[PDB]
């Protein structure tokens, strides 16, 4: 269905060195309600434009 196509602005995260780093940031993003999509097998996730700065800030504080 076309009526069900949804788009979102934001940022795609990738290039994680470890499963633990990927899941840490993925979990934090879910906790604060800004994670829109993820794929554990690729270690990627997509964060809303609104939430991106908080996720970056958390990453830089670890």
């Amino acid at each position: 269905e076309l009526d069900r196509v949804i788009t979102y602005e934001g940022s795609l995260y990738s290039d994680f060195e470890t499963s633990q780093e990927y899941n840490l940031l993925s979990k934090y993003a879910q906790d604060i309600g800004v994670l829109l999509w993820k794929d554990d097998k690729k270690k990627k996730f997509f964060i809303s434009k609104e939430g991106n700065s908080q996720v970056l800030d958390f990453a830089k504080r670890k």
Partner: protein, 228 residues
């Protein structure tokens, strides 16, 4: 007399139903927008809302496959072509006089003619090509004022529409026609407080069960009931 609120209730297509709706090209696809579980849930909620008010409700289905899937699941009586004269009169007399039976389902056999009973609420499960005028006539014949002279509206017409399907095209048309006929008319996209009721198809698996059944149907199952 009767003061009627007219509403279209726009219901999203479940993604699984929308997927098949697109892929299928024959009139069979009408069944996917008719049985769409969001539309069933809207119908179920409206029956609950109105039965709490002790309103009498007729639900019209022009499609027999749909008539039965809805009525039997909601445990309401239904009338269509092959319903015998005896059983039909039993149901109508129950609708009219038994306070425990205030919702019935009727197919295209209702208009016309046997004597359509009176009701305070008329819900049309489907919309199609192309009689805007038969709709208003049926609305007029059926709807009587709930005996609320103070109230703004004492009778209710709802037409349930599946979003992202050919059903919507019939809407700009119906709205224009009904208001031109002197009716108060609105579009409802979200029914206030459906999440406070226990409605069918809450799980994906139950929706998939219905989807399989619809896919098993044929183009004949998607034709309107014809009657002479």
């Amino acid at each position: 007399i009767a003061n009627v609120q007219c509403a279209e209730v726009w219901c999203p297509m479940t993604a699984e139903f929308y997927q098949e709706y697109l892929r299928e090209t024959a009139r069979k696809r009408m069944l996917l927008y008719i049985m769409n579980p969001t539309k069933f849930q809207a119908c179920q909620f409206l029956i609950q809302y109105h039965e709490r008010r002790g309103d009498k409700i007729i639900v019209f289905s022009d499609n027999v496959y749909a008539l039965q899937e809805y009525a039997l699941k909601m445990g309401k009586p239904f009338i269509y072509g092959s319903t015998p004269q005896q059983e039909r009169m039993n149901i109508l007399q129950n609708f009219q006089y038994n306070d425990q039976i205030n919702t019935i389902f009727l197919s295209k056999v209702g208009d016309t003619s046997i004597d359509l009973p009176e009701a305070t609420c008329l819900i049309q499960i489907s919309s199609h090509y192309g009689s805007r005028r038969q709709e208003a006539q049926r609305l007029g014949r059926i709807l009587r004022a709930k005996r609320r002279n103070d109230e703004g509206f004492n009778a209710f017409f709802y037409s349930l529409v599946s979003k992202d399907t050919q059903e919507m095209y019939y809407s700009t048309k119906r709205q224009a026609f009904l208001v031109d006929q002197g009716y108060a008319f609105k579009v409802i996209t979200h029914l206030h407080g459906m999440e406070n009721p226990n409605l069918a198809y809450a799980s994906p698996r139950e929706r998939r069960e219905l989807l399989q059944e619809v896919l098993a149907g044929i183009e004949v199952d998607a034709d309107n009931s014809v009657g002479r």
